[PDB]
Amino acid sequence: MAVNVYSTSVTSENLSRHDMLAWVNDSLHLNYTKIEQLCSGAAYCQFMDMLFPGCVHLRKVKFQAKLEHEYIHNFKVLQAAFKKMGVDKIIPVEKLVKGKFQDNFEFIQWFKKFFDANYDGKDYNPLLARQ
Amino acid sequence: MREIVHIQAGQCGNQIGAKFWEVISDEHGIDPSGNYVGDSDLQLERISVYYNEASSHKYVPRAILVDLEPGTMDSVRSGAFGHLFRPDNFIFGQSGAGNNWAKGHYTEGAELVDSVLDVVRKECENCDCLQGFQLTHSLGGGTGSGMGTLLISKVREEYPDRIMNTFSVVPSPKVSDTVVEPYNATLSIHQLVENTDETYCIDNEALYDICFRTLKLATPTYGDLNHLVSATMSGVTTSLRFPGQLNADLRKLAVNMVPFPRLHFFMPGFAPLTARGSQQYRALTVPELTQQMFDAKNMMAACDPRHGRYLTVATVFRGRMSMKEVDEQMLAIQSKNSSYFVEWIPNNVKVAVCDIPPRGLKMSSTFIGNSTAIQELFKRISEQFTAMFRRKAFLHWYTGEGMDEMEFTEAESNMNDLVSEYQQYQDAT
Amino acid sequence: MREIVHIQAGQCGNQIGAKFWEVISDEHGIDPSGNYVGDSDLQLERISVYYNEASSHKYVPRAILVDLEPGTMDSVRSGAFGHLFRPDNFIFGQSGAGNNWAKGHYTEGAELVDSVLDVVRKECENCDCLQGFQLTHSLGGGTGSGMGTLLISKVREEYPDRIMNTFSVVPSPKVSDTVVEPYNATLSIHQLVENTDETYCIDNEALYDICFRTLKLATPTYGDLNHLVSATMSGVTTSLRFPGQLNADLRKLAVNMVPFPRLHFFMPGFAPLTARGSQQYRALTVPELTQQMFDAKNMMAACDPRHGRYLTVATVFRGRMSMKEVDEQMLAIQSKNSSYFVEWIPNNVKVAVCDIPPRGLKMSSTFIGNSTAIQELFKRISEQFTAMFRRKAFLHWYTGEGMDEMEFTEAESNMNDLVSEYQQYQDAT
Amino acid sequence: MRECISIHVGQAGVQIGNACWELYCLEHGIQPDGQMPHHHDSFNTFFSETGAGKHVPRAVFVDLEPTVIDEVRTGTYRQLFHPEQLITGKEDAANNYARGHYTIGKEIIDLVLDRIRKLADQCTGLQGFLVFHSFGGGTGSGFTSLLMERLSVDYGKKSKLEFSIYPAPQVSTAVVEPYNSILTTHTTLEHSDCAFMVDNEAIYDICRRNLDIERPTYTNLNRLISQIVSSITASLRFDGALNVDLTNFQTNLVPYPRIHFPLATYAPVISAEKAYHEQLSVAEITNACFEPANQMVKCDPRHGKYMACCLLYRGDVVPKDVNAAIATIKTKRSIQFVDWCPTGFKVGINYQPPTVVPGGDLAKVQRAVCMLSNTTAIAEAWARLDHKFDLMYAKRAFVHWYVGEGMEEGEFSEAREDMAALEKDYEEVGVDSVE
Amino acid sequence: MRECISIHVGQAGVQIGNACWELYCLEHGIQPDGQMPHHHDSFNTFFSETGAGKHVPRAVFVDLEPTVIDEVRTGTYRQLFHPEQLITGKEDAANNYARGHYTIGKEIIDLVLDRIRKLADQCTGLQGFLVFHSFGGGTGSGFTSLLMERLSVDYGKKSKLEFSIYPAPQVSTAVVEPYNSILTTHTTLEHSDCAFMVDNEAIYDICRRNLDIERPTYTNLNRLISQIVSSITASLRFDGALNVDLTNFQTNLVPYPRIHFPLATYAPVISAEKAYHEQLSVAEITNACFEPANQMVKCDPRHGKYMACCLLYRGDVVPKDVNAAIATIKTKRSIQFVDWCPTGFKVGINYQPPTVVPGGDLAKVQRAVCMLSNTTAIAEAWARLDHKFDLMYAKRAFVHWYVGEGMEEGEFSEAREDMAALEKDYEEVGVDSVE
Ligand SMILES: Nc1nc2c(ncn2[C@@H]2O[C@H](COP(=O)(O)OP(=O)(O)OP(=O)(O)O)[C@@H](O)[C@H]2O)c(=O)[nH]1
Ligand SMILES: Nc1nc2c(ncn2[C@@H]2O[C@H](COP(=O)(O)OP(=O)(O)OP(=O)(O)O)[C@@H](O)[C@H]2O)c(=O)[nH]1
Ligand SMILES: Nc1nc2c(ncn2[C@@H]2O[C@H](COP(=O)(O)OP(=O)(O)OP(=O)(O)O)[C@@H](O)[C@H]2O)c(=O)[nH]1
Ligand SMILES: Nc1nc2c(ncn2[C@@H]2O[C@H](COP(=O)(O)OP(=O)(O)OP(=O)(O)O)[C@@H](O)[C@H]2O)c(=O)[nH]1
Ligand SMILES: [Mg+2]
Ligand SMILES: [Mg+2]
Ligand SMILES: [Mg+2]
Ligand SMILES: [Mg+2]
Kindly report the three-state secondary structure assignment for every residue of chain E: CCEEEEEEEHHHHHHHHHHHHHHHHHHCCCCCCCCCCCCCCCHHHCEEECCCCCEEECEEEECCCCHHHHHHHHCCCCCCCCHHHCECCCCCCCCCHHHHHHHCHHHCHHHHHHHHHHHHHHCCCEEEEEEECCCCCHHHHHHHHHHHHHHHHHCCCCEEEEECCECCCCCCCCCCHHHHHHHHHHHCCCCCCEEEECEHHHHHHHHHHCCCCCCCCHHHHHHHHHHHHHHHHHHHHCCCCECCCHHHHHHHHCCCCCCCCCEEEEECCCCCCCCCCCCCCHHHHHHHHHCHHHCCCCCCHHHCCECEEEEEEEECCCHHHHHHHHHHHHHCCCCCECCCCCCCCEEEEECCCCCCCCCCCCCCCCEEEEEEEECCCHHHHHHHHHHHHHHHHCCCCCHHHHHHCCCCHHHHHHHHHHHHHHHHHHHHHHCCCCC
Q: Phi, psi (5° rounding) for residue B223?
A: -60, -50
> Cβ contacts (< 8 Å) between B109 and chain A: which residues?
101
Do C325 and C406 belong together in one domain?
no
Nearest CA to E21 among E55, E50, E64?
E55
Do B220 and B352 belong together in one domain?
no
Instruction: Provide the experimental method for this PDB entry.
Output: cryo-EM
Q: What three-state secondary structure class fits B81?
A: coil
Q: What three-state secondary structure class fits A66?
A: coil
Do B50 and B172 belong together in one domain?
yes
8 Å CB contact between B102 and B403: yes
Do B227 and B365 belong together in one domain?
no
In this structure, the residue with its CA closest to atom 3 of ligand 1 is B12
Touching A: D residues 376-435, CB under 8 Å: 432
Ligand 8 is an ion; residues with CB less than 5 A from it:
E 11, 65, 92
Peptide bond into B272 cis (omega under 30): yes
Q: How far from each other are the two terminal CA atoms of chain D, in whole angstroms?
A: 48
Do B194 and B334 belong together in one domain?
no
Distance CA E123, CA E47 (A): 11
Q: For residue C379, what is the domain's CATH number?
A: 1.10.287.600
**Beta B310-317 vs C198-200: how paired, if at all?**
unpaired
Is the pair A, C in contact (3+ CB pairs within 8 Å)?
A: yes
Q: Last residue of a domain, which of B213, B238, B257?
A: B257
Q: What three-state secondary structure class fits D388?
A: helix
Quote the ligand 3 centre to D174 CA distance (angstroms): 9
Do B226 and B308 belong together in one domain?
no
8 Å CB contact between B147 and B14: no
Nearest CA to C347 among C334, C333, C336, C365?
C334
Count CB-CB contacts under 10 A for residue E339. 10
Nearest CA to E146 among E95, E188, E116?
E188
Number of domains into which chain B is organized: 3
Q: What secondary structure letter does DSSP report for C48? A: T
Quote the ligand 4 centre to E72 CA distance (angstroms): 16
**Ligand 3 pocket: which residues have CB below 6 Å?**
D 10-12, 15-16, 92-95, 100, 134, 136-140, 165, 173-174, 200, 218, 221-222
Q: Do B219 and E320 touch (CB under 8 A)?
A: yes
Cα E90 → chain centroid: 27
Nearest CA to B192 among B381, B398, B428?
B381
CB B98 near ligand 1, within 6 Å? yes
Distance CA D222, CA D58 (A): 20
Pocket test for ligand 1, best of B12, B15, B179, B229 (most atoms within 8 A of CB): B12
Do C105 and C234 belong together in one domain?
yes
Cα nearest neighbour of D328 on chain A:
A94
Distance CA C366, CA C358 (A): 12
Query: Which of D209, D269, D271, D276 to mutate to test binding with chain E, by most E CBs within 10 Å of its CB?
Result: D276
> Cβ contacts (< 8 Å) between A11 and chain E: which residues?
256-257
Query: Which of D1, D341, D428 to mutate to test binding with chain C, by most C CBs within 10 Å of its CB?
Result: D341
Quote the ligand 3 centre to D134 CA distance (angstroms): 6
Nearest CA to E121 among E5, E246, E237, E41?
E5
Maximum C-alpha span of chain B: 63
Residues of each annotated binding site of B: 10-12, 15, 69, 99, 138, 142-144, 177, 204, 222, 226
Q: Last residue of a domain, which of B358, B374, B390?
A: B374
Q: What three-state secondary structure class fits B399?
A: helix
Atom index in ligand 3 nearest the CA of residue D174 equals 27
Distance CA D351, CA D370 (A): 14
Q: For residue B25, what is the domain's CATH number?
A: 3.40.50.1440
Task: Specify which residues E348 forms β-bridges with.
Answer: E312
Residues of each annotated binding site of B for GDP: 10-12, 15, 99, 138, 142-144, 177, 204, 222, 226
D235 and chain C in contact, CB less than 8 A? yes
Is the pair D, B in contact (3+ CB pairs within 8 Å)?
A: no
Touching C: D residues 366-405, CB under 8 Å: none
Do C181 and C196 belong together in one domain?
yes
Do C45 and C189 belong together in one domain?
yes
- Residue C135: C-alpha distances to residues C113, C166, C167, C190 (Å): 15, 5, 6, 17
Q: Chains touching chain D at 3 or more Cβ pairs under 8 angstroms? A: A, C, E
Query: Resolution in angstroms for this experimental structure?
Result: 4.2
Residues 6+ apart with CB under 8 A from B407: B187
Do C313 and C217 belong together in one domain?
no
Atom index in ligand 4 nearest the CA of residue E63 equals 19
8 Å CB contact between B236 and B136: no
Q: Is C177 annotated as a binding residue?
A: yes
Ligand closest to B9 (CA) is: 1
Count of alpha carbons within 13 Å of E114, Cβ hemisphere only? Answer: 13
Residue ranges making up the domain that contains B210: 3-257
8 Å CB contact between C187 and C404: no
Do B174 and B62 belong together in one domain?
yes
The phi-psi region of residue E167 (left if phi > 0; otherwise alpha if psi is between -120 and 50; otherwise beta) is: beta
Atom index in ligand 2 nearest the CA of residue C172 equals 29
Walk across the sheet containing B130-138 and list its strands: B91-92, B63-67, B3-9, B130-138, B163-169, B198-202, B265-271, B365-371, B310-317, B350-353
Peptide bond into D268 cis (omega under 30): yes
> Cβ contacts (< 8 Å) between C388 and chain D: which residues?
340-342
Distance CA B235, CA B361 (A): 13
Q: Do B403 and A36 touch (CB under 8 A)?
A: no
Query: Which of A11, A12, A103, A112 to mutate to test binding with chain B, by most B CBs within 10 Å of its CB?
Result: A11
Atom index in ligand 2 nearest the CA of residue D244 equals 25
Residues of each annotated binding site of B for Mg(2+): 69
Q: For residue C358, what is the domain's CATH number?
A: 3.30.1330.20
The minimum CA-CA distance between B387 and chain A, rounded to whole Å, is: 20
Do C192 and C275 belong together in one domain?
no
Directed axis angle between helix E10-27 and helix E67-74, to 10°?
20
Written as one string, the DSSP assignment of D202-244 is HHHHIIIIIS--S---HHHHHHHHHHHHHHHTHHHHS--SB--
Q: Last residue of a domain, which of C239, C257, C275?
A: C257
Distance CA B8, CA B26 (A): 20
CA C416-C417-C420 angle, 5° bins: 90
8 Å CB contact between C27 and C360: no
Pocket test for ligand 4, best of E16, E135, E165 (most atoms within 8 A of CB): E165
Give the dihedral of Cα atoms E33, E35, E39, E44; nearest 10 deg: 90
Nearest CA to E347 among E371, E329, E324, E368?
E371
Identify the sign of the CA torsion B325, B331, B335, B339: positive
Q: Which of E154, E156, E190 sits opposite A106 (nearest CB)?
A: E156
B33 and chain C in contact, CB less than 8 A? no
> Cβ contacts (< 8 Å) between B96 and chain E: which residues?
245, 247-248
In this structure, the residue with its CA closest to atom 13 of ligand 2 is C141
**Beta B198-202 vs B163-169: how paired, if at all?**
parallel
